[PDB]
């Protein structure tokens, strides 16, 4: 049947509207709640509806976060409404997000099964947009804490990427502790493994470097089997951290003695044909020292993305490249002057 | 149970040392 609810626009005036949807169906389940997919009856558009059980007393981290966000590389919150909870002090929040069935994961797994590697052009396009979204959400102090191929939505025709699933996201406040066992194993930063609770949103950059590395290699770079095996996988490439590095990751972790293993060459981590600049970029993302990782903006401005800033550039299918330089003040806040490097003089309006 | 195992390696201060051991087996 055709469901109709009174919802509030995600980005926009707090005044409700009716909203009817149909062809609803569960596509995901878990601890977080339930996710459905449906079609809008007046927009035709397909959307995803995440239904979470919320405690009335408190606000909903995810809802609050999605409301500040209005960026082109971030899944848009169309509407949101509530549902009758069962236990008097509980409600079901219904985030009506945008639906895209394609993910950088599916795509990547596609090429992987076809034994070949993803085209460099796409690796630059995807990673680029990923960083902008990171730069944007970080500018608010928001950390996604769950960056991975599966949470990266794609438009197969436009080549546009959107960050999604802010279920683990959180507005970070220095001095206030954050859970250390957060983020999907394969993408979890070293400091999280070492028990850090005073970490920063730079754990998202470590994760991005992992996604990048994964696109270059054809499979995740650090496929640890547990928390301890994760560090072992990391050590296999970066070797063991120096005391200075350990202090940086976790000021409160102490190990009086441990065997020191050196790092392997990045040039050998990847296949021989891997573009050098992708490796270079990757080495500045997968660092033990959190503060040493490139910031999203610095990364967007990296030499690896130079080709995206070229006027002639086009997609392998003659199509145009999505909006890559429509940076806002918010988005540039961390280092406004970099704006002159990110924005090609051939894009200035 | 690895969470606990990790929690102990971290509490005890034998995370790096232990990971290296496993690295050699």
């Amino acid at each position: 049947k055709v469901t109709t609810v009174v919802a509030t626009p995600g980005q926009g005036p707090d005044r409700p509207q009716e909203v009817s949807y149909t062809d609803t169906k569960v596509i995901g389940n878990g601890s977080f709640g339930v996710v459905y997919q449906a079609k809008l009856c007046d927009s035709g558009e397909l959307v995803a509806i995440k239904k979470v059980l919320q405690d009335k007393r408190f606000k909903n981290r995810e809802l609050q976060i999605m409301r500040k966000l209005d960026h082109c590389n971030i899944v848009r919150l169309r509407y949101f409404f509530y549902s009758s909870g069962e236990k008097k002090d509980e409600v079901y929040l219904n985030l009506v997000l945008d639906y895209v069935p394609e993910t950088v994961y599916r795509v990547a797994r596609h090429y992987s099964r076809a034994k070949q590697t993803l085209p460099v052009i796409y690796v630059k396009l995807y990673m680029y947009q990923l960083f902008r979204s990171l730069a944007y959400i970080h500018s608010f102090g928001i950390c996604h804490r769950d960056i991975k191929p599966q949470n990266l939505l794609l438009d197969p025709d436009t080549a546009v990427l959107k960050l999604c699933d802010f279920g683990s996201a959180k507005q970070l406040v220095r001095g206030e502790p954050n859970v250390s066992y957060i983020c999907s194993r394969y993408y979890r930063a070293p400091e999280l493994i070492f028990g850090a609770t005073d970490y920063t949103s730079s754990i998202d950059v470590w994760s991005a470097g992992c996604v990048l590395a994964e696109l270059l290699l054809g499979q995740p770079i650090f496929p640890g089997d547990s928390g301890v095996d994760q560090l072992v996988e990391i050590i296999k490439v970066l070797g063991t951290p120096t005391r200075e590095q350990i202090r940086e990751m976790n000021p409160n972790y102490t190990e009086f003695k441990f065997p020191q293993i050196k790092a392997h060459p990045w040039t050998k981590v990847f296949r021989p044909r891997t573009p050098p600049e992708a490796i270079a970029l990757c080495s500045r993302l997968l660092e033990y020292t959190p503060t040493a990782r490139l910031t999203p903006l610095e990364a967007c401005a990296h030499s690896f993305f130079d080709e995206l800033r070229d006027p002639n550039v086009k997609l392998p299918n003659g199509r145009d490249t999505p909006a890559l330089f429509n940076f806002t003040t918010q988005e540039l806040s961390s280092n406004p002057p970099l704006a002159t490097i990110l924005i090609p003089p051939h894009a200035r309006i | 149970d690895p969470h606990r195992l990790l929690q102990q390696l971290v509490l005890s201060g034998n995370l790096i040392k232990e990971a290296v051991r496993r690295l050699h087996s």
Side-chain angles (χ1 to χ4, degrees), chain A residues 282-297:
Chain A
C282 196
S283 75
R284 299 299 299 280
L285 303 179
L286 301 185
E287 290 264 27
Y288 269 144
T289 300
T291 62
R293 295 169 197 160
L294 265 39
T295 67
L297 267 202

Side-chain angles (χ1 to χ4, degrees), chain A residues 128-300:
Chain A
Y128 181 73
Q129 305 184 69
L130 168 59
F131 285 116
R132 286 194 68 196
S133 69
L134 245 38
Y136 182 72
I137 69 171
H138 286 181
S139 65
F140 293 86
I142 300 166
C143 191
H144 187 281
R145 312 161 86 201
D146 196 26
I147 296 297
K148 66 182 172 186
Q150 302 79 329
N151 293 320
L152 304 174
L153 310 182
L154 298 154
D155 181 323
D157 309 306
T158 74
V160 176
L161 178 158
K162 298 186 187 306
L163 185 50
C164 82
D165 184 9
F166 284 64
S168 302
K170 175 182 168 185
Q171 181 115 5
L172 296 183
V173 176
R174 273 175 289 184
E176 284 163 13
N178 314 286
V179 61
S180 86
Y181 194 74
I182 191 79
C183 199
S184 313
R185 194 189 301 141
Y186 294 1
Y187 310 81
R188 192 174 305 146
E191 59 269 47
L192 293 181
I193 299 171
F194 277 79
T197 44
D198 66 315
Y199 56 85
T200 67
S201 45
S202 73
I203 64 166
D204 274 351
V205 177
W206 166 281
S207 297
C210 282
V211 173
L212 201 215
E214 189 169 335
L215 296 177
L216 303 171
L217 297 177
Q219 62 188 74
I221 172 163
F222 306 131
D225 307 325
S226 58
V228 172
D229 191 47
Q230 189 54 35
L231 180 64
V232 165
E233 282 297 304
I234 294 176
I235 295 185
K236 293 172 73 175
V237 178
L238 317 200
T240 66
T242 61
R243 302 187 158 288
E244 187 198 15
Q245 291 177 307
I246 304 168
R247 229 163 286 146
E248 292 283 345
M249 300 191 277
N250 197 335
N252 298 92
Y253 175 79
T254 300
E255 186 154 1
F256 308 91
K257 179 210 62 181
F258 67 81
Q260 295 185 287
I261 305 174
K262 211 188 296 184
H264 280 45
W266 281 110
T267 46
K268 298 313 162 186
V269 175
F270 310 86
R271 86 176 63 269
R273 286 79 56 199
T274 305
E277 265 180 346
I279 304 183
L281 167 56
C282 196
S283 75
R284 299 299 299 280
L285 303 179
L286 301 185
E287 290 264 27
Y288 269 144
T289 300
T291 62
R293 295 169 197 160
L294 265 39
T295 67
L297 267 202
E298 302 186 314
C300 274

Side-chain angles (χ1 to χ4, degrees), chain A residues 45 59 62 93 122-123 132 135 170 210 294 335:
Chain A
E45 305 178 57
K59 303 169 184 175
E62 192 161 8
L93 175 47
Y122 286 122
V123 169
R132 286 194 68 196
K170 175 182 168 185
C210 282
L294 265 39
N335 192 316

Side-chain angles (χ1 to χ4, degrees), chain A residues 2-38:
Chain A
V2 175
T3 317
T4 309
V5 297
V6 179
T8 301
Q11 293 94 182
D14 257 296
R15 189 135 76 147
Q17 325 175 182
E18 262 193 13
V19 171
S20 303
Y21 58 97
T22 186
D23 307 315
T24 318
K25 63 182 65 174
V26 170
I27 67 177
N29 194 50
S31 47
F32 60 85
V34 174
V35 178
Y36 308 75
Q37 183 233 69

Side-chain angles (χ1 to χ4, degrees), chain A residues 124 128 277 300-311 313 325 341 344:
Chain A
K124 305 190 179 188
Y128 181 73
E277 265 180 346
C300 274
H302 190 269
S303 331
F304 174 62
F305 298 123
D306 280 352
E307 172 186 356
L308 299 185
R309 279 180 291 274
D310 174 0
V313 72
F325 326 91
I341 307 174

